[PDB]
Every structure is written in structure tokens, then in C-alpha cells.
């Protein structure tokens, strides 16, 4: 008990469901991160290739082996707001660039 090699795979694969992009976390194939997912067809994967990387070293795509599908990863939103405030005012004027 709680030793050896034979174990139970029931506390790791619980959800087994990928959303349509809600800026969720992931711990895929050892590498972890956060982002949204988007369904995009891909025909460049192979039998031993499941992840897509760029020249910089980030994650771009991901192939799920339990469903034989390919998704792309988009970064989450992290920006600031420009607030113009006068001398005596109640609420400043907000601006979200782009």
C-alpha cells in the first residue's frame, strides 16, 4: 500500500474536458501556464509530436491525445486603464486603449 509501482489513476484525470477559452490554467506534459484555447484544425502534427513551440520558446499549439484534436493557445488579457482626472470631480474619465 502506497508503495511499489502499480497505482490507481483516479485522482488525476477527473475533468478530461477542454473549454473554448476562458483564460484557464494548464499543467500539460510537464509545462504549466495560463491562457485561453481556440479550436483550430492542424495537419502538421505527427505520432510523437503533441506540442507546438515558436522561435522565442513559448507555447502556440497543443494536440490532445484523448480526443485527436488540435487547439491553439492565446495569452490572457493583462492591461491598464488611462484615467483623466480634473481638480474637483466625482469620477475620472476612463479609457481602455485598443
Amino acid at each position: 500500500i502506497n508503495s511499489g509501482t502499480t497505482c490507481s489513476n483516479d485522482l488525476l484525470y477527473s475533468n478530461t474536458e477542454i473549454s473554448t477559452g476562458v483564460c484557464v490554467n494548464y499543467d500539460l506534459y510537464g509545462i504549466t501556464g495560463q491562457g485561453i484555447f481556440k479550436e483550430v484544425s492542424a495537419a502538421y502534427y505527427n505520432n510523437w509530436q503533441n506540442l507546438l513551440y515558436d522561435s522565442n520558446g513559448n507555447i502556440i499549439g497543443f494536440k490532445d491525445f484523448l480526443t485527436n484534436k488540435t487547439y491553439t493557445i492565446l495569452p490572457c488579457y493583462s492591461g491598464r486603464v488611462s484615467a483623466a482626472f480634473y481638480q474637483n470631480s466625482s469620477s475620472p474619465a476612463l479609457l481602455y486603449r485598443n
Binding site: 511499489g4 509501482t5 506534459y29 502538421y44 502534427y45 505527427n46 510523437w48 509530436q49 503533441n50 506540442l51 507546438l52 513551440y53 515558436d54 522561435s55 499549439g61
Partner: protein
């Protein structure tokens, strides 16, 4: 000097030389390099620091063949080399024909340490086109060998005496092309984990697996093939099992719009290679570099 258990003491002779080949490792074509573990690069140049040969060192033929009697010097250096930091192997597929039926068998590789039964030994063994890779507590015999299925010999293959199945960390089966000419293998370890790469046909090498062991491996060994074999007294045949060491070096690889390597250049071979690696391009511009 492989195992520490007596399994057989029959047909044990004393002595009956690694054939150094004149060819060198070729680069800028794809041979020698390998794909990433599971990462894909499309239409880009990547400067990757990995484990590769240096300039095309000479190979060593470690293939051992026996007919009736075995030898004691075979289980000793320089036949039992040292797995310093990596091994790149090139195997020749021995294609035999019996009753208009094709068969393909070759040697068996065992990497690890002494490991009578204390630590794991990673053994890759071929079975008529099925590569079985197992990392367990296999007990190596004092004189192991491997017989061939087609045209069997008079001895019996027995390299482990484990009556009960011991604990294992990775046991898997892979399928390769049974009508291939050459096979390529790439083994190395880093940060405590051991990687594997194989290639049945093609210039680059494909990914096999990565296993966490925690300990540093010591030696690798190719088991002999005591069977109806390369001995040309009846049928002509040739076996070539070349092995070359590895080294931590930085290469520059290219990927087209599909994801297959077209050419790969070094960075410590010629003066132009250094410029190509500094500019990260195969056709650098005009200028004066240091």
C-alpha cells in the same frame, strides 16, 4: 563482467578487435541531429544546445557473433565501453530470406550499471520487427547472449533468470519498418533523466521516451548474437553496428513550412559556422565579425 550470477558454463573458450571504419559523420544533411522531445517548429531557424558528435570521429564495430563456443574476453573492455554522456548508434538491418519469407533481426542493447539485482537496467531487444524497451530489475547473467528465431542455433537464449516479474518503470513496444536498410539510435542522460531517440528510415531521428531514474548510468553493452548469422561459410551477410560518443554542443537547425529538418550546421567546426551561428542564418550578410 556484465552480471554476477551463474547461468551457464558450457562452451566457454578464451579467445578466437573493434573494426574502426574509415567513414566520418556527415552533417548539413540531417544525419546526426534529432527532433525535439514533443515540440514542433515551423519555418524557422533554431539555435539549440544539445548532445551531438563533434566533427565526425571514427566509428567502432561492437557487433559480436558466435557459432558454438563463447569467449571470456568479450565480456570485458574495450568491448564494455563507458557511457560517458551519450551514444549515437548506427545499425545495419540483416535481412534474411527463408521460404520466400523475409526476416529482420539484429543485436540487443542494455544500458545501466553493474546492477546484479539492485538497480534498473534499460534493455532494448528486437523481436522480428518489434522493439521491446524495458527498464526493470533484470538480473544479467555472467554470460548472456541472444539466439535468432529464424534458422535457430543449438543454444538457448537466456539473459535473465527472474522467475517472477519484478518492479519496472517503463515497458513499451514499438514498431519499425521490417524492410529497412539502416537504423539510427540516440541515447543520453541529463539532470538525472534518460532520453531515447530512434529512427527506422530517414536522415533525422524520432523521439522514443524520457525516463526519470535519479541515478547516473555507468555502462552500456551490446549482447552477442550466437546463432546462424553473419558467418559467410554458407550465406553471404554483413553486420555493421557503429557506435560514436556524444558531446554537449550547440547546433543550428532549420525547419520549413511543414516541420522537417532540411539542413543543420555546427558552431565550432569552421570559421563560417561561427558566423552562421552568430547571425542565426544560413546566408549571413556582408560584414566584419569577431
Amino acid at each position: 563482467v556484465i552480471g554476477d550470477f551463474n547461468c551457464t558454463n558450457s562452451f566457454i573458450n578464451d579467445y578466437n578487435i573493434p573494426r574502426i571504419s574509415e567513414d566520418v559523420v556527415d552533417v548539413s544533411l540531417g544525419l546526426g541531429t534529432y527532433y525535439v522531445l514533443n515540440r514542433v517548429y515551423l519555418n524557422t531557424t533554431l539555435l539549440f544546445t544539445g548532445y551531438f558528435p563533434k566533427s565526425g570521429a571514427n566509428f567502432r564495430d561492437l557487433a559480436l557473433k558466435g557459432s558454438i563456443y563463447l569467449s571470456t574476453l568479450w565480456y570485458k573492455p574495450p568491448f564494455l565501453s563507458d557511457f560517458n554522456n551519450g551514444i549515437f548508434s548506427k545499425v545495419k538491418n540483416t535481412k534474411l530470406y527463408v521460404n520466400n519469407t523475409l526476416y529482420s533481426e539484429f543485436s540487443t542493447i542494455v544500458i545501466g550499471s553493474v546492477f546484479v539485482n539492485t538497480s534498473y537496467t534499460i534493455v532494448v531487444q528486437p523481436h522480428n520487427g518489434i522493439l521491446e524497451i524495458t527498464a526493470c530489475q533484470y538480473t544479467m547473467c555472467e554470460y548472456p547472449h541472444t539466439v535468432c528465431k529464424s534458422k535457430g542455433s543449438i543454444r538457448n537464449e537466456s539473459w535473465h533468470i527472474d522467475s517472477s516479474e519484478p518492479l519496472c518503470l517503463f515497458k513499451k513496444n514499438f514498431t519499425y519498418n521490417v524492410s529497412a536498410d539502416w537504423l539510427y539510435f540516440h541515447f543520453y542522460q541529463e539532470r538525472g533523466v534518460f532520453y531515447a531517440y530512434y529512427a527506422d528510415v530517414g536522415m533525422p531521428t524520432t523521439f522514443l521516451f524520457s525516463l526519470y531514474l535519479g541515478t547516473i548510468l555507468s555502462h552500456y553493452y551490446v549482447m552477442p548474437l550466437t546463432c546462424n548469422a553473419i558467418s559467410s561459410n554458407t550465406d553471404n551477410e554483413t553486420l555493421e553496428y557503429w557506435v560514436t560518443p556524444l558531446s554537449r554542443r550547440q547546433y543550428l537547425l532549420n525547419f520549413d513550412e511543414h516541420g522537417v529538418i532540411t539542413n543543420a550546421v555546427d558552431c565550432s567546426s569552421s570559421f563560417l559556422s561561427e558566423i552562421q551561428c552568430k547571425t542565426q542564418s544560413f546566408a549571413p550578410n556582408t560584414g566584419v565579425y569577431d
